[PDB]
Automatic annotation (TrEMBL), chains A, B:
Pfam families: ketoacyl-synt (PF00109), Ketoacyl-synt_C (PF02801). It is an enzyme of class 2 (transferase). Pathway: Lipid metabolism; fatty acid biosynthesis. CDD domains: KAS_I_II. Keywords: Acyltransferase, Fatty acid biosynthesis, Fatty acid metabolism, Lipid biosynthesis, Lipid metabolism, Transferase. GO terms for cellular component: cytosol. SUPFAM superfamilies: Thiolase-like. The active site is at residue 163. This is 3-oxoacyl-[acyl-carrier-protein] synthase 2. It catalyses: a fatty acyl-[ACP] + malonyl-[ACP] + H(+) = a 3-oxoacyl-[ACP] + holo-[ACP] + CO2; (9Z)-hexadecenoyl-[ACP] + malonyl-[ACP] + H(+) = 3-oxo-(11Z)-octadecenoyl-[ACP] + holo-[ACP] + CO2. The keyword Lipid biosynthesis applies. Signal peptide: none annotated. It comes from Pseudomonas aeruginosa.
Amino acid sequence: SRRRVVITGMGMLSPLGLDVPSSWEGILAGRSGIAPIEHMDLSAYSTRFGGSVKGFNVEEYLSAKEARKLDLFIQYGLAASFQAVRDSGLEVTDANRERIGVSMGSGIGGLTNIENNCRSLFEQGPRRISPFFVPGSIINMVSGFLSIHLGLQGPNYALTTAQTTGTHSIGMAARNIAYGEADVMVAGGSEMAACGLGLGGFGAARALSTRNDEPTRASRPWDRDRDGFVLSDGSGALVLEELEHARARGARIYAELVGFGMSGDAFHMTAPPEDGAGAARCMKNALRDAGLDPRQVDYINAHGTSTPAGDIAEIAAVKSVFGEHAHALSMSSTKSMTGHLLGAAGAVEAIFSVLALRDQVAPPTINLDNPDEGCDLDLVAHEAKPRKIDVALSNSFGFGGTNGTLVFRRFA
Amino acid sequence: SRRRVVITGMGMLSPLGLDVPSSWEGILAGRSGIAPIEHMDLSAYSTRFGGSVKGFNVEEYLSAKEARKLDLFIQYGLAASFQAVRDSGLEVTDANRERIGVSMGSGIGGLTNIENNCRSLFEQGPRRISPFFVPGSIINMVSGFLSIHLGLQGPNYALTTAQTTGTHSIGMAARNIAYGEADVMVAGGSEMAACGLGLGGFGAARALSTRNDEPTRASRPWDRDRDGFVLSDGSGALVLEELEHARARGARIYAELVGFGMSGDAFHMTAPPEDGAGAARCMKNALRDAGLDPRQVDYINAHGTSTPAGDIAEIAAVKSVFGEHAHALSMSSTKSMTGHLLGAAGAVEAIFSVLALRDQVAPPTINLDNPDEGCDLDLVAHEAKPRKIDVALSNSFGFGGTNGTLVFRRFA
Ligand SMILES: CC(=O)Nc1cccc(C(=O)O)c1C
Ligand SMILES: CC(=O)Nc1cccc(C(=O)O)c1C
């Protein structure tokens, strides 16, 4: 048997807002965070738009000196983490610092830093590479820097499971607390891949929407005219906490993390199976982990990335796991509004799933103008839907066929 | 209730050879795998030597067609993984494929591929970025590709905890099996950071030995004339397996994995505390996890990277954890011979720790000509030591202050 895990703090940078409540207001109003990308020449690229974090002020969190040493994805992850810890009200002491850890991950990490240092290396040679290039670029430095700044001496790691990273980071943090390896974890992910190599890389695989003329309409999960995902930047972080620890200090509890599932498709490098059999097993695993019948699920935050093969495979998976109940639950992709934050997608979508529980409302899938063949579930087309939500699922699936499901429940 | 975990398979690429037994014979002969680097021109760099994998033939595992699409670190991880799985004698069936997962990590992952695509982007433009740049370079794709080739549908993820990756990967995979999430895991790491950004980046931070005149003498843990670590390439993979599962199929058991510890220094991004307080917390966590009296520890495979601050800190933590018993155990750094495989360091070192148990021999710390002040333990200077080993401990420390300890014992 196993300790209960609750959510006491949340923090976020997204294309919709510089914090959770601004982002969540965006979500419920159906607002897009997608725009042509600025201060960067995309003439030669097939995709010129994405979800940028707008007006980020790193000096609310770090000195100019510390910020200069760190890739944007690390800055974004620390901002989300500080917000989350602040939101939790947690006081770190000598009594508890050994019981507080971090698992903040990234899918692709320091690409902007790697770009900038590559320029220096090619143009001038290795003597112009920054001394902080290595520590300032590696994916575990959100966990590293946060632990140094707050004096966190608990489990310290980072997951990198491509587009599953955020979901996996929160799940494995939850396991640390459940099995008594920590009382508190800060978990989630951060990503900044809106550079040459990210838009170029995903663009070369023709994975991206090229709807340059209508950026806010590019991300249209399960719509018949979808043409690939929209690349987005940001971060999400949650304070996970053992229930008796939260209660003792009178912490405000948002929701309970009751279920985590994992699976591998063992199918293709960059496409799921057509029936989404891996997604199905992962969702099944998460529900068994929670001791929940598929019947109990009210809301699914879909992976729902606006790809042809991806979107249909997730519908097939949900129909398989849930049967006739798949038509009674509400499923939406918030990527319709935020785009695809890759490694940070599972973190910000775990937060939206928790807020769907707090506010009893399913966020919309915007741009769902003509549902494709088979896309006949309640996909919350166009507008937010107030409704009863006791249990909310959040799916992430990644290159390599790596799948993650979180199950959240209302607490009382 | 927590299940017992054993090692049934091991695989390796190292600077000492292209499998486990060849690598192991080099370790016991006191052989160095460190040489001037031949694959690039480094006349502009302050470090012009490393531990390269010599004569690696990827077409012993994969078609040339697939190999071409994959960064060396992925090639190296799959090679070590395929060896470990072969060595286990495990058969993947529809009955067990959902119970077999993989956690192979990397510190930096596809940096050679990323640099090469960065050259294309800057010299030509984004149109020359390979369509395989993302799935051929990101860290989670050892786990991805291995699951695709072998049909593994169990937990599928990657850690990135810098030079601690391999230790954390094995540790966390063991926890998956211990807590019932899988019956088998392929776990370890792989690294190939010997490109312009890698040697230039660590050089810029002055982390590397610059002993170009005698590359084989550069890696000299606890020697008073050490001047930084030696950058090394390779992969270690282990098959971890629930004890009853292994017994049930008549598996050859190398050793039991009895202990796993984690901790954060919460001190500095790129140096340990002088007293190795974080290392000490980690080893105590692992010894407690294993239910051991610290006096049962016979052999320690040190992190022992040949850095001024790092080597002395590890002595301090061992003296702090074992008191007078520090003078009875044997502690050696195989990095004296292999150099520093970064994310793969913990993976090849876990393997050398299990082989120390199989063969009852402490591997040498070669090049320990003049042990530094306070470095007065049995550091197995120069020559392999035959001795009683029931319990072996392997340490890894990483940028961010992220620590890991594994404890293995002989299985009867
Ligand atoms: C194996 C696979 O490609 N799974 C999957 C399914 C749907 C969307 C996405 C995506 O995040 O773009 C991914 C990665
Ligand atoms: C926080 C820190 O820098 N720890 C540590 C200690 C000793 C060696 C090494 C290494 O791999 O060179 C590291 C990374």
